[PDB]
Amino acid sequence: ASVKVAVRVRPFNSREMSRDSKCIIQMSGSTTTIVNPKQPKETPKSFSFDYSYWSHTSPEDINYASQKQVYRDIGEEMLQHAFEGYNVCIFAYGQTGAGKSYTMMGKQEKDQQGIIPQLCEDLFSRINDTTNDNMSYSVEVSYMEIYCERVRDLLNPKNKGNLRVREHPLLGPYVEDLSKLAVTSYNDIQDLMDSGNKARTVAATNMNETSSRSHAVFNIIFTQKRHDAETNITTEKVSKISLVDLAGSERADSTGAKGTRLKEGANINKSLTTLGKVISALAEMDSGPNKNKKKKKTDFIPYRDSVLTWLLRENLGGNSRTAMVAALSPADINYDETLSTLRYADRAKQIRCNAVINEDPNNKLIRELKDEVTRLRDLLYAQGLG
Amino acid sequence: MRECISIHVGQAGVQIGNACWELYCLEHGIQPDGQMPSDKTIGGGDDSFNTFFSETGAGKHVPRAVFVDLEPTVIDEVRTGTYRQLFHPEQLITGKEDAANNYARGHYTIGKEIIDLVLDRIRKLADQCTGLQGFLVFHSFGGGTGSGFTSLLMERLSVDYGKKSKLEFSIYPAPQVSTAVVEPYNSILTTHTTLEHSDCAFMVDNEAIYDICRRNLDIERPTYTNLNRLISQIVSSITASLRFDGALNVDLTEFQTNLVPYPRIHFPLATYAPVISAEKAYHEQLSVAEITNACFEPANQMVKCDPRHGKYMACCLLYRGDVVPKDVNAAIATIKTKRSIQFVDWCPTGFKVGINYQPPTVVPGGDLAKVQRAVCMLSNTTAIAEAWARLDHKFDLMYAKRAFVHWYVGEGMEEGEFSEAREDMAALEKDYEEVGVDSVEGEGEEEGEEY
Amino acid sequence: IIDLVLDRIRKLADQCTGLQGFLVFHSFGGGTGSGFTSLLMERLSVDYGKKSKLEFSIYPAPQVSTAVVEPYNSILTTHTTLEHSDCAFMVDNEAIYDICRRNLDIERPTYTN
Amino acid sequence: MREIVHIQAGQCGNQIGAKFWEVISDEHGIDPTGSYHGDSDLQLERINVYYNEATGNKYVPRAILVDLEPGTMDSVRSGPFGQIFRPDNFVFGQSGAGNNWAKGHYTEGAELVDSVLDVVRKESESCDCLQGFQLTHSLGGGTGSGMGTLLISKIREEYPDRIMNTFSVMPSPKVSDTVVEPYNATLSVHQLVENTDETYCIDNEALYDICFRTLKLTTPTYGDLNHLVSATMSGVTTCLRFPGQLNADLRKLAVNMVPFPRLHFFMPGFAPLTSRGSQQYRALTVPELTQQMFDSKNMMAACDPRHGRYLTVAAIFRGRMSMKEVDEQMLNVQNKNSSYFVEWIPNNVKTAVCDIPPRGLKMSATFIGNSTAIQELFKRISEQFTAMFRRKAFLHWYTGEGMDEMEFTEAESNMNDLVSEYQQYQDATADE
Ligand SMILES: CC(=O)O[C@H]1C(=O)[C@@]2(C)[C@H]([C@H](OC(=O)c3ccccc3)[C@]3(O)C[C@H](OC(=O)[C@H](O)[C@@H](NC(=O)c4ccccc4)c4ccccc4)C(C)=C1C3(C)C)[C@]1(OC(C)=O)CO[C@@H]1C[C@@H]2O
Ligand SMILES: Nc1nc2c(ncn2[C@@H]2O[C@H](COP(=O)(O)OP(=O)(O)OP(=O)(O)O)[C@@H](O)[C@H]2O)c(=O)[nH]1
Ligand SMILES: Nc1ncnc2c1ncn2[C@@H]1O[C@H](COP(=O)(O)OP(=O)(O)NP(=O)(O)O)[C@@H](O)[C@H]1O
Ligand SMILES: Nc1nc2c(ncn2[C@@H]2O[C@H](COP(=O)(O)OP(=O)(O)O)[C@@H](O)[C@H]2O)c(=O)[nH]1
Ligand SMILES: [Mg+2]
Ligand SMILES: [Mg+2]
Secondary structure (H helix, E strand, C coil): CEEEEEEEECCCHHHHHCCCCCCCCEEEEEEEEECCCCCCCCCCEEEEEEEEEEEECCCCCEEECCCCHHHHHHHHHHHHHHHCCCCCEEEECCCCCCCHHHHHHHHHCCEEEEEEHHHHEEEHHHHHHHCCEEEEEEEEEEEEEEEEEECEEECCHCCCEEEEEEEEEEEEECCCCCCEECCHHHHHHHHHHHHHHHHCCCCCCCCCCCCCCCEEEEEEEEEEECCCCCCCCCCCCEEEEEECCCEEEECCCHHHCCCHHHHHHHHHHHHHHHHHHHHHHHHHHHHHCCCCCCCCCCCCCCCCHHHHHHCCCHHCCCCHHHHEEEEEEEEEEHCCCHHHHHHHHEEEEECEECCCCCCHHHHHHHHHHHHHHHHHHHHHCCCCCC | CCCCEEEEHHHHHHHHHHHHHHHHHCCCCCCCCCHHHHHHHHHCCCCCCCEEEEEEECCCCECEEEECCCCHHHHHHHEEEECCCCCCCEEEEECCCCCCHHHHHHHHHHCCCCHHHHHHHHHHHHHCCCECCCCCCEEEEEEEEHHHHHHHHHHHHHHHHCEEEEEEEEECCCCCCCCCHHHHHHHHHHHHHHHHHCCCCEECCHHHHHHHHHHHCCCCCCHHHHHHHHHHHHHHHHHHCCCCCCCCCCCCHHHCCCHHCCCCCCCCEEEEECCCHHHHHHCCCCCCCHHHHCCHHHHHHHCCCCCCHCCEEEEEEEEECCCCCHHHHHHHHHEEEEEEEECCCCCCCCEEEEEEEEECCCCCCCCCCCCCCCEEEEEHHHHHHHHHHHHHHHHHHHHHCCCCCCCHHHHCCCHHHHHHHHHHHHHHHHHHHHHHCCCCCCCCCCCCCCC | CHHHHHHHHHHHHHHCCCEEEEEEEEECCCCCHHHHHHHHHHHHHCCCCCCCCEEEEECCCCCCCCCCHHHHHHHHHHHHHHCCCCCCEEEEEHHHHHHHHHHHHHHHHHCCC | CCEHHHHHHHHHHHHHHHHHHHHHHHHHECCCCCCCCCCCCCCCCCCHCCCEEECCCCEEEEEEEECCCCCHHHHHCCCCCCCCCCHHHECCCCCCCCCHHHHHHHCCCCHHHHHHHHHHHHHHHHCCEEEEEEEEEEECCHHHHHHHHHHHHHHHHHHCCCCCEEEEEEEEECCCCCHHHHHHHHHHHHHHHHHHCCCEEEEEHHHHHHHHHCCCCCCCCCHHHEEEEEEEHHCCHHHHHCCCCCCCCCHHHHHHCCCCCCCCEEEEEEECCCCCCCCCCCCHHHHHHHHHCHHHHCCCCCCCHHHCCCEEEEEECCCCCCHHHHHHHHHHHHHHHHHHHHCCCCCCCCEECCCCCCCCCCCCEEEEEEEHHHHHHHHHHHHHHHHHCCCCCHHHHHHHCCCCCCHHHHHHHHHHHHHHHHHHHHCCCCCC
C-alpha cells in the first residue's frame, strides 16, 4: 500500500492580515495550484494529492472542509483499517503556524475538534455497540513527547526525566517505562488528553502565540478478543494507532527567537531535516525497486540520525498503514516555505508500505496447515479419492 | 590490599602448605621466626605484602593460613619444626582418630565438633582483612579428610561468604599408581561438592609430576618434597599478579572471567614451562618462544591426559621476569598456526596474557635452576573428560558387588548417595561432550533471502 | 560583539568630517568573514545608508582551497555582497601565486607577499 | 580563552595520559615540580589550555585520573611526573572490573561515577570558556570501556554544547590479550556512536608495525606506543596554543571532517619518522611530509585506505613553510589518487598551518583521515561477536551483573547499521 496524502489550507492570522493579505493557494477537487507572487508570468505549478481541504472561507459551500469532513475522509478509514487488524498512523507536517496542532487536537471547548477526539469518540462508540457475550474489546493509551532528543511522558507528569529508547529484535524500536494506562470510557481518555496537553511544552513566538516546542506521539493499543468453545481465535487482533503532531520548521529572522527558544528551534529543524531526508529516500528506493526493475541490491535509509525517525521506523515504512496531513498557509510572504511542504508531500505520495495482520506464529502455522489439509481433502473428495 | 586466605586440609594439603610457605617466606625476605631484617636495615617499605602476611605492631609477620587435619602427627611435625614460631599457635587439629580413607567418617561422623572451630578462626582471619579477594583450598581426592571435610567446609563457606571466589588445588588420583584401595569412592563422592561449591578447580596428578621430574630435572628417585615445590611454584605464579608490579596484571576475578565459559566447566589444567636442572640450564636460551611452546607439549602436562584428543576452550598465560609483550604476541601467533592445537570455533580470541616483572626465586636445596624468564599456562580444555572416565570405570568395578560399602553406611551414609554422585558425574561428562562439538554447519542451518 | 563593533564605528565616525566611505576586508569561505560581514553590512546599511561601502574579499579558488565547506559559506554570502555593498573587489589566491611565481620569481611564496 | 578538561580511565588510558603530560610539559617548559623554566615567551601565552595556575607561580595540569584498581594510580605517582598532578583528582576504588564491561558500567562504576563527576564539575566551573573534553581509554578491557562510556553519557547529558573527543585503543585481529574483547568492544562502540563528536581509532598492531618497519626498533615496549599516541594528541590541539598562518580549532576539524553525524571515526597519523640513523639521508620538506602522510604503512588504525575511499582528511602542519607548496601538494595528492576520494565532496582535504614546530624538529605534521576502510575493523569485531553469542560463550558473567540478551542484540544491530552506512559511500559510481 501507499502513503495516503492529505493537504489542508488554512485562513489568515493577525500577522498576515496586518501585512499583505494576498492568497496564493487555489484548489479544485483533488488538485492544488500554487502561484509565485514574485513571478506572475510563470506557470501556476500544480500538485495532485489524495485529499485536499479548503478551510479559508467559513460560510461558503465551495468545497469547504470542516473538521468533520477531514475526519470522515481520513480518520474513519484509518479506524476501519485498525479494526481490520492493521497498525495505522496519521502524522502531521508543514511549517510553523499552519495547523498541525489544530488538525490533530483542535479546540476542545467547541464543535471544532481534532482528529484524535473524533477518532477516540468513534472507537468508543464502535466497541460499545458491537459488544457481545463472546466478543470483547480492550484499549490502552499512551502519550510521549520528544523535546530536545529526549523522550518525556505526558500522562504521568511526576516522572520528570528522559526515558530510555530500546530495540526489540522482532517489534523494532520502543520506549521503555512508558506509562501506558488502561481506559474504559470516553471521559477517561478525555481526562488523559487534557492532562497531556497541559503537560506539553508550549512557548510564544512571533509566528505563533502558542508554538509547539516538541514533537508528540499519541499511541492507542487496541485488542479484540473473540472467545468461543470450538477454537475461536482468542485476543486475535492487536492494532496500534499512532497519531503524531510534529513541531514545525522555523526561521530565526521571522521567529525572533533568542536563547532557549533558538536552541529549541535548532533541534526542531535538525529533526525535521532528518525526517525529510528519510522521506526522500524511502521514496526513491521504493519507486526504483518498484519501477527500475527488481535488483533490490542494497539501499540504506538513515533512520538512526534522529530519535524521531527512530521511533517512527515502522510507521514511515514497513509494517503500518500511514497517512500524512500537510498544513498550508495562504499568505504570499510564506510562499518559499509552503511550496517546500508541498514538494515533500509529493514525495510522500511515492512511498510504499508492507503491513500484515498480527497473530501468534504457532497459531499462524497451525491455521495455515489446517487450511491446507482442508483444501487437499476437498480436492481429493471432489476427484473421487477422498 | 589484595588479601587471600589459604586453607590446607589433610596430609597432602599440609605438606603442600609447608612448601608454599617456605617459598612465600623466601620471596618476601621473611625469616622463619617471622621477623623481616630488610625493613630494619632499609628503614621501611612495602615488603610485608598483605596478600599472605599480616603485620603486628612489634614487626612480626603472621601468615594468613589455616591448617586443618584429624591426625595430630602431620601438624605436630610443624609445631616443633623450623617454622614453629611463624604460625599462630591455633592450628585446628582434632585430638582424635582420622577419617580412615572414609568420606562418611570425615563428612558426617567426625567432621563435626572441629568444623565450628575452623569457621570461627576463618571468620577471625576474614575480619582482619580489607578487600578480601578469595580463598585457596588445598586438599586431596581419595583421602577421607581431604574429601569429606573439604566438602563440609566448602558447603559452609558458600553458605556464609557467598560472593568471594574459592579456587581449589587438588591431587586427582592417577590412572595406574595408587596409595589406597578405596580412592574411587571418595573421589566420586566429593565431585558432587566440588562441582557446585567451587569456582575453579586445578587438578594435578602425581604420575605426571614423577614423569616430569624423571625427564626434565634428571631426578631418578623423587619424593613428595619435589612435587610440593613444583606446586608451590605454580601457585606463586598464579598469585604473583597481585603482589608485584608488571606490564599487565591479572587478578583472581579475571581468571574466572576468561577461563570459565559456563558455570559447570571450571576444571582447567595447569603447566609450568621452564622446569629444568642447573646443568641443563646451560646449552639453552630459555626465550619466550621456547617456554610458550613447552607449555603446549603433551609430555609436560601435569595431568595424565593428551590435549591432542580434545579441544582448547580457553588459555591463560602468566609470564614472569625479563619478558616483553612483542615476543608474547609472536609466540601466540606461532601457536595459532599449528594444526595439532585445535581451538573450539566459538572462541576466536582464545588467549589471556599477563606479565609480571618479579622473576622466580630459587629455594636452597631445591632442584630447579635459576632462570630469567618463566611462564605458567592454564588451559580449560575437553581432554580432562578422559581423566574422569577412567575413574568412573574403576568405581563401577567395585560398586557392582558393593565392596567396601558397609564401612560407609556404618558412618552415617545410605547406599543411594553413591548412585546420585555417579549420575552427577555422568551429567558433567556429558556437558563436556556437548561443548567441544563444532557448531552445526552454518549454525542457522542455511539462509539467503532475496537481496 | 556586533553592538560593541558598531559602537566603536560610531565613535570613529563622529570624529570624522566629510566621511567618504568604508573599506571592508573579509574572506569568503570562513565562518566569521561571511556571517559577521553579513551582520555588519546589514547594520551599516541601516544606520549610515548613503555612505559608500567598498569590499576587498578573497574568493574561493577553482582548484586549491583550505576547507571542505567553502562553497556553502561563499554562496550564503551572496545576498549581503549583492544588496548592501556598492562595489566589491574579488581576488583569488591561485592568481596571485602564479603572479609571484612568474613575475617576481618567488618559487615558494607565502601569505605575506 | 579555550580550555580543555582531560579524563583518563583504566591502565591504558592512565599510561597514555602520563606520557602525554610528560610530552606537553616538555613542550611548555614545565619542570616536574611544576615550575616554568622555558626560554620562549610564547610558551606561557596560552598555558591555560591545559594547566591551572597555583600560588607559588606553579602550574597544575587539568587532569582527572580514574580507575577501579589502585595499583595503576601508584605507578603514576611513583614516576618522573607523578608529583605534578594534584592528589585530589586521583579518584579510585577497590575490586576492579575484572575485564567485565557490566561491572565497569552497571555495578562498580555506578558508585564511583558520582565522585568523578564531582571532580569534573569542579574543574569545569573554574574554566573561563570551556572548549571540550578528551578521554583516553581502551575499548577491549573492563573499567576503561565501561566507565569511559558512562562518563561520556553523563557529560553529554550535562554539557551538550561542548566538544567530546576520545582516543580509544580498540582490539586488533592478531594481537589479542583478553578472551572477551569482542563483547566489550561491541558495547563500547554502541555507546560511542551515539555519545561522541570525534573518535580517533588506535590499534596496537599498527603501532607495532610502525615501530618495527619505520623506526627500525628491535625491542618496542608500551612506552614507545604511548610516545606515538601522545605526539598525535599534541598535534591535534596545537592550534589552540600557538599562533599560525592558518588556524584550526577542534570545531573546525569536526565541521570539515564529519559529513553526517554517525561517521566520526578517524584514522590518525604523524610525520616525520626517521629511525635515528636515516635522518641524515632524508631531506625534510613539505613534499616528504606529504609523501609519508598518506602512505598506507604509516597509519595508526591497521586499516588500509586503499580498500575504501576518503570521505575527508585533515592535515595540520607545524613549522615555517610556504602555503603555496602546501596547497599544491594537497591538490596533487587529490588528483593523482583520484580513485581514493569521493566525487560528491570537492576539495575534501582540510589544511592548517602552525608557526611553532616541536622542540627538536624544523618541520612536523599530523594527519586525521575519515575513510570507509574503517568498516573493516568493525566487521571483524562483529564476526567474533557472533561466534561467541550464538553459543552464549561467556554470557553468564555479564547477565549476573544486571544485563540481558536484548542489550547485546541491539548493540550488534547498531554496529552493523554503522558498517552499512560506511559501506554506502565505498563503491564508485554514485557520482554528481
Ligand atoms: C637529532 C634529534 O633531535 O633526534 C630526534 C630523532 O632522531 C627522531 C628520529 C625522533 C626521536 O624519537 C624516537 O626515537 C622515537 C622512538 C619511539 C617512539 C617515537 C619516537 C627522538 O627520540 C625524539 C625527539 O623528539 C622530540 O623531542 C619532539 O619534540 C617530541 N617530544 C618527545 O619525543 C619527548 C620526549 C621526552 C619527553 C618529552 C617529549 C614531540 C613530537 C611531537 C609533538 C610533541 C613533541 C627528537 C627530536 C629526536 C630523538 C631524541 C632521538 C622522532 O620523534 C618524534 C616522534 O618526534 C621519531 O621520528 C621522529 C623524528 C626524528 O628524526
Ligand atoms: N603431591 C602430593 N600428594 C600427596 C602428598 N601427601 C599425600 N598425597 C596424596 O594423597 C593421597 C591420600 O590422601 P591423604 O592426603 O593422605 O588424606 P589424609 O589427609 O591423610 O586424610 P586421612 O585419610 O583421613 O588421613 C595419596 O594418594 C597421595 O598420593 C604430598 O605430600 N604431595
Ligand atoms: N483549517 C483551519 N481552519 C481554521 N483555523 C485553522 C485551520 N488550521 C489552522 N488554524 C488556526 O491557525 C493557527 C495555526 O494553527 P496551529 O495548529 O497552531 O499551527 P501549529 O503548527 O500546530 N503551531 P506550531 O506548533 O508552531 O507548528 C491556530 O490558531 C489554528 O487554530
Ligand atoms: N598502547 C598501549 N596499550 C595498552 C597498554 N596497556 C594495556 N594496553 C592494551 O589494553 C588492553 C587491556 O585493557 P586494560 O587497560 O587492561 O583495560 P582496563 O582493565 O579497563 O584498564 C590490551 O589489549 C592492551 O593491548 C599501554 O601501556 N599502551
Ligand atoms: Mg503546534
Ligand atoms: Mg592422613
